[PDB]
Design an enzyme around this catalytic site. Structure first.
Site, short mmCIF file in Angstrom:
data_model
loop_
_atom_site.label_atom_id
_atom_site.label_comp_id
_atom_site.label_asym_id
_atom_site.label_seq_id
_atom_site.Cartn_x
_atom_site.Cartn_y
_atom_site.Cartn_z
N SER C 267 11.46 33.07 -24.54
CA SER C 267 11.26 31.75 -23.96
C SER C 267 11.77 30.65 -24.88
CB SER C 267 9.78 31.53 -23.66
OG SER C 267 9.55 30.23 -23.15
N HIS C 295 9.27 36.69 -18.41
CA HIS C 295 10.10 35.54 -18.11
C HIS C 295 11.31 35.86 -17.25
CE1 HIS C 295 8.50 31.99 -20.12
NE2 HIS C 295 8.08 32.78 -21.09
N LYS C 327 4.35 33.56 -14.33
CA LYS C 327 5.55 32.74 -14.45
C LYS C 327 6.20 32.51 -13.09
CE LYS C 327 5.03 32.93 -18.95
NZ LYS C 327 4.27 34.19 -19.19
#
Ligand SMILES: CCCCCCCC/C=C\CCCCCCCC(=O)O[C@@H](COC(=O)CCCCCCCCCCCCCCC)COP(=O)([O-])OCC[N+](C)(C)C
Lengths: 464, 153, 492, 62
Positions: C267, C295, C327
């Site tokens: 990230s 992610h 997410k």
């Protein structure tokens, strides 16, 4: 000697410096205790390749035995509540930690639905990065006011609450005195920190006194180190593994007499003990300020996901920056927080439900006494207690099989029981196998006595 | 912010001296100290140079061999709670480019300040005491040992 | 391993003058922090903080003062860039409750006004599933009405439901693996399942920039941990060779197991793992692979299946595939996918399976509906438009910022854009200036990062229209002119 | 116009020297020390060092 000193003084400076460095060299040889052998060998490319080729790793997971009792999960066709359906059989729930029956109130569902309409499901980020809602702050304020405490902090998961609260304050080099029969979450919290762990006998202040005296004796030896060593005592308000309460006043006296802080875990006793259901502190009348940190989860009594820790701002403000389950995880979904707030409102409106639960627990615990092959373990005030084998076999597998036999036969009799589950290789002190009995304010007296009679009949038929 | 957000390393304090432009910043700080010392009107050149040496060595000793621990919460549960910065550097690897640079630079400063002081004996003994006070802790043998139990805890 | 498509990434070095000025600023801050600590110690200036109760003055101090240095002197000065509350759904535009401080961020007072329509670049909704009106919301409402909110037991106990089995089978179908398991927290997944797989006598090879959950899970188990450089296949190969050849450290013995912990998209850095090389190395050296895919499970891939689809690889090659629903799908939880034997061993010997409360029914219903929409079970054209729009937005935003003279990290495909600030004061300056123009961003400072690189993270979304991106880009250009944040030498 | 440019340069000075996040009295302390050092340096340079740089400045002005 004086003549030798004068003769040495007669010498030039460089000569004396050379003699001094020679003497230092002699000292270095004399104290060169290492006997180096003057050799150097290195591996060959083909040797490395063949060494790589020989190595064979173990499988990722060990081969499974097909007799695992935990391999079969009970399947509930609907919401786990009173008059539930387990494995396709209509039963009465005696296994779910829903003490106040707040799971299926219309008001809780209405509040959750309103918050779901307003916000949605997910929060989409941690508390640091745009994951803080107004519902989170509202719930924290409500918890702080309910517990009559300065501040509270919310985690989105019951295990992570204590498993992250404990390592934040206890570091490497400190001393922790923890009860022998402590839940797995406390054990993992104590393992995450690298402090020294000293177990003492369950609910035994003699052993705690002995350990504290030994620690003071060790302190007398090296006071400088003892001035930078912190001491903690981690206990539970109502133990899950045994169902027994803890003696707070003696613990408070020991704290003030040996300078050791206290961490209380109140998952089971949060909404069941005390006149207003604020935990074991009301049960014993202890002042809330004597306990430094009180940790609970919002799942057993409030019937929603999450957990919380309450205390003074001085101790709570540290967790917002050092608690790993708080800093590096997404916040609690808003609808669960709204459900928790509504449950708190319901608990605050009428405090007689705690008395009702206490009387039901008394009735069931008194009625269950008298089984030939089973013994009740736990106190009369506990909403959840255990039934254990009086005489056990040599091995644990037969005990588990007998208990599961009893559970299945009861389940065919419209009584839904459960058996306590543990990780055998991981637990520090593995409790004996047992059948877990859980009491709920939804259950009527007739249902409780029917359950007692059915358990008695099945147990005396099976154990014989 | 919190340690571990953008890097898995438990103790960032062990890498601050391996970063980019840190050596140039150190040399520029020494130069700026020398300039502001020359700025004083009534002080002679050898006195200025010995003050530069003494002040740099004192600050270096205070920062590297006196302050122990980390200025921030660390997720290894305070493993370096008692170690000083020189001991934390590079996770205990005794020789490294950064350690070599930090050990060499006071000696070069000593050479320059000895040349500019015209080898006076008083300045010699002052600068030699300071240089020894800095260089003695840098010895690999003198790792993790506190004499007479001072600064132990 | 070979790539079917070019693999472009760029991490430009810091200009030397910028590094020197960064060190100047940090030194000034440290000196003034020491001065303030000295003033506070002697009570010359009254301390605005809570203290221990009078009855415990003779106890050992709870904390160590020096550990709070950067908290008292650096974090507190720019504390208002974090913990900003919101009173709306975290969509493309969010409403932020306004607060002010009169004692330099030591306490915040809440004003009645509410900032409205702030462009959201801090939330994690990649595919724009964070909505208060839709089909997923109605399904979640129905399941909330039927099942209630929250379950009051454990999976091995009476707390296992039919919704959980449906979710697990649907997840197994979505990933392509044989079986999968679902948990109620992404952090807990790692922290409670890594200790089960490995133990004392095994080796864990962890990347340089792993999440805190992976590190905590590796520490809880008794295995040995060795760290290799971020996306450096040479370092990984060297560590693997040394581990296989030289054996255990003290008593030289063969390692029982070797596990490699990697992530799909990192990230903060913004890079994508070199999966073909890692797979080739683990096949050559007989190692096991743990792939954190939080992610990338929705952001990457032509159909949004993750990194393995992005590289066009075989899901059966990765031993353990973990992921998080927070997410992309807009609901809490996590999952682990793999072969049936692994899933059975996890169902039997997982900490969260035995001691932790399972998921919530509305959450699992929302996950099920979102993932059905993504895979196209509903039949509506939605679920492909989201992925295509996310890809276009990422490409457009990254190209536009790179041609403006900024320094940007990571691949050209990752929907996470780290802009580089490099100085401690510019962190707070950027945060305040961007909030003043109705853009919400996230800023990361020293102790989280290396010392010279402090950054600001932009999270793009499929719900960001073109006009929103254009407005954000013009405001970013104005602020970059104001703060001189265009350090790039290659193009400007 | 020029005042805006000078204010911008002061803003950049604050950003670079990290004075932006300090309180006003800390800014006062730092600025006073800085101007004192600069003035003392100019005094020493004028008194001791020859005014060759002053000649260069005069030539540039002309
Ligand atoms: C070990 C301590 C190391 C202190 C190093 C001091 C360096 C800072 C310094 O010299 O200037 C500072 C004084 O600094 C002080 O006056 C603070 C002196 C120590 C305070 C310790 C407080 C303990 C509680 C002030 O620096 P300035 O003029 O604001 O720039």
């Amino acid at each position: 000697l004086v003549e030798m000193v004068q003769a040495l003084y007669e010498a030039p400076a460089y000569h004396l410096i050379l003699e001094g460095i020679l003497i230092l060299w002699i000292i270095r040889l004399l104290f060169s205790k290492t006997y180096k052998l003057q050799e150097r060998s290195d591996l060959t490319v083909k040797e490395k390749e063949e060494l790589i080729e020989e190595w064979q790793p173990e499988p990722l997971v060990p081969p499974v035995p097909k007799d695992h009792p935990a391999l079969n999960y009970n399947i509930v066709s609907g919401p786990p509540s009173h008059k539930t359906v387990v494995n396709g059989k209509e039963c009465i729930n005696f296994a779910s930690f829903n003490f106040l029956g707040l799971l299926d109130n219309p008001r809780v569902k209405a509040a959750a639905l309103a918050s779901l309409k307003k916000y949605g499901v997910g929060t989409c980020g941690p508390r640091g990065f745009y994951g803080t809602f107004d519902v989170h702050l509202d719930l924290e304020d409500r918890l702080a006011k309910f517990m009559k405490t300065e501040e509270a902090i919310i985690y989105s998961y019951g295990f992570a609450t204590i498993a992250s609260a404990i390592p934040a304050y206890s570091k490497r080099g400190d001393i922790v005195f923890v009860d022998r029969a402590a839940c797995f979450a406390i054990q993992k919290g104590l393992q995450a920190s690298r402090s020294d762990i000293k177990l003492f006998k369950h609910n035994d202040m003699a052993d705690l006194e002995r350990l504290l005296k030994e620690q003071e004796i060790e302190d007398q030896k090296n006071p400088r180190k003892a001035r930078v060593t912190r001491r903690f005592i981690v206990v539970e308000g109502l133990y899950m593994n045994t169902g027994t309460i803890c003696p707070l006043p003696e613990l408070v006296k020991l704290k003030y007499k040996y300078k050791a802080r206290i961490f209380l875990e109140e998952s089971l006793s949060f909404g069941v003990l005390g006149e207003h259901g604020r935990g074991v502190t009301e049960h014993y009348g202890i002042n809330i300020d004597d306990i430094d940190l009180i940790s609970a989860n919002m799942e057993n009594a409030l019937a929603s996901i999450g957990g919380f820790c309450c205390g003074r701002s001085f101790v709570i403000d540290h967790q917002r920056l050092s608690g790993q389950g708080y800093c590096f995880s997404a916040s609690l979904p808003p609808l669960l927080a709204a459900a928790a707030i509504e449950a708190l409102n319901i608990m605050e409106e009428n405090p007689g439900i705690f008395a009702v639960l206490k009387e039901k627990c008394g009735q069931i615990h008194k009625a269950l006494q008298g089984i030939s092959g089973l013994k009740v373990v736990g106190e009369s005030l506990s909403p959840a207690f255990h039934l254990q084998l009086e005489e056990s076999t040599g091995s644990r597998e037969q005990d588990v099989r007998l208990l599961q036999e009893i559970v299945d036969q009861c389940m065919n009799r419209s009584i839904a029981l459960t058996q306590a589950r543990y990780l055998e290789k991981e637990e520090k002190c593995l409790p004996p196998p047992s059948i877990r009995v859980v009491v709920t304010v939804e259950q009527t007296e007739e249902e409780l006595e029917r359950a007692a009679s059915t358990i008695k009949e099945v147990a005396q038929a099976v154990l014989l | 912010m919190n340690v571990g957000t953008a890097h898995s390393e438990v103790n960032p304090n062990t890498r601050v001296m391996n970063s980019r432009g840190i050596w140039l910043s150190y040399v520029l700080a020494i130069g700026l100290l020398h300039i502001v010392l020359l700025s004083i009107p009534f002080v002679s050149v050898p006195v200025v140079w010995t003050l530069t040496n003494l002040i740099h060595n004192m600050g270096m000793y205070i920062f590297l061999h006196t302050v122990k621990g980390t200025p921030f919460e660390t997720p290894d549960q305070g493993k370096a709670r008692l170690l000083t910065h020189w001991e934390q550097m590079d996770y205990g690897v005794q020789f490294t480019a950064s350690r070599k640079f930090l050990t060499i630079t006071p000696i070069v400063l000593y050479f320059l300040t000895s040349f500019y002081t015209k080898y006076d004996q008083i300045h010699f003994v002052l600068n030699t005491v300071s240089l020894m006070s800095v260089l003695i802790p840098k010895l690999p043998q003198l790792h993790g040992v506190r004499i007479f139990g001072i600064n132990k805890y | 391993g070979l790539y079917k498509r070019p693999f472009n990434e760029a991490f430009e070095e810091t200009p030397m003058l910028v590094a020197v000025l960064t060190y100047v600023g940090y030194g000034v801050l440290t000196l003034f922090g020491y001065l303030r600590d000295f003033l506070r110690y002697w009570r010359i200036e009254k301390c605005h903080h809570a203290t221990e109760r009078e009855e415990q003055k003779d106890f050992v101090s709870l904390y160590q003062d020096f550990e709070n240095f950067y908290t008292r002197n650096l974090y507190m000065r720019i504390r208002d860039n974090w913990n900003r509350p919101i009173c709306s759904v975290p969509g493309a535009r969010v409403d932020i409750m306004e607060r002010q401080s009169h004692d330099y961020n030591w306490s915040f007072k809440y004003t009645g006004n509410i900032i409205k329509g702030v462009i959201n670049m801090g939330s994690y909704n990649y595919l724009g599933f964070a909505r208060n009106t839709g089909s997923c919301q109605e399904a979640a409402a129905k399941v909330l009405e039927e099942y209630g909110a929250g379950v009051c037991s454990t999976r091995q106990e009476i707390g296992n439901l039919d919704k959980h089995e449906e979710l697990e089978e649907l997840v197994a179908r979505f990933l392509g693996v044989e079986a999968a398991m679902a948990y109620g927290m992404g952090f807990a997944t790692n922290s409670m399942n890594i200790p089960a797989l490995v133990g004392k006598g095994c080796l864990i090879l962890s990347d340089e920039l792993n999440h805190a959950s992976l590190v905590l899970g590796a520490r809880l188990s008794g295995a040995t941990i060795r760290i290799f450089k971020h996306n450096n296949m040479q370092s990984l190969e060297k560590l693997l060779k040394d581990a296989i050849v030289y054996g255990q450290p003290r008593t030289r013995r063969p390692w029982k197991k070797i596990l490699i912990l990697v992530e799909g998209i990192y990230s903060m850095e913004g890079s994508i793992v070199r999966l073909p090389e890692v797979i080739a190395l683990k096949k050559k050296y007989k190692a096991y692979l743990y792939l954190d895919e939080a992610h990338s499970i929705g952001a990457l891939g032509p159909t949004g299946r993750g990194v393995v689809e992005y590289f066009g690889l075989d899901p059966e090659d990765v031993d353990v595939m973990m992921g998080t629903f927070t997410k992309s799908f807009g609901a809490s939880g996590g999952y682990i996918g793999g072969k049936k034997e692994l899933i059975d061993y996890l169902r039997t010997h997982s900490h969260s399976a035995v001691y932790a409360t399972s998921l919530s029914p509305p959450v699992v219903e929302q996950i099920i509906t979102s993932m059905k929409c993504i895979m196209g079970q509903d039949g509506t054209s939605l679920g492909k438009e989201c992925v295509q729009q996310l890809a276009e937005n990422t490409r457009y935003f990254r190209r536009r910022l790179k041609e403006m003279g900024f320094i940007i990290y990571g691949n050209e495909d990752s929907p996470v854009v780290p802009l580089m600030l490099y100085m401690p004061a510019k962190i707070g300056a950027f945060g305040r200036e961007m909030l003043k123009r109705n853009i919400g961003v996230v800023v990361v400072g020293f102790p989280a990062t290396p010392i010279i690189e402090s950054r600001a993270r932009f999270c793009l979304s499929a719900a960001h229209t073109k006009e929103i991106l254009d407005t954000a880009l013009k405001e970013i250009d104005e602020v970059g002119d104001l703060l001189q944040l265009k350090y790039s030498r290659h193009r400007l | 116009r020029a005042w805006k440019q000078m204010s911008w340069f002061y803003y950049q000075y604050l950003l670079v020297t990290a004075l932006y996040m300090l309180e006003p009295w800390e800014r006062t302390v730092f600025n006073s020390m800085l101007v004192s050092i600069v003035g003392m340096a100019l005094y020493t340079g004028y008194v001791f060092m020859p005014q060759h740089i002053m000649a260069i400045l005069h030539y540039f002005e002309i």
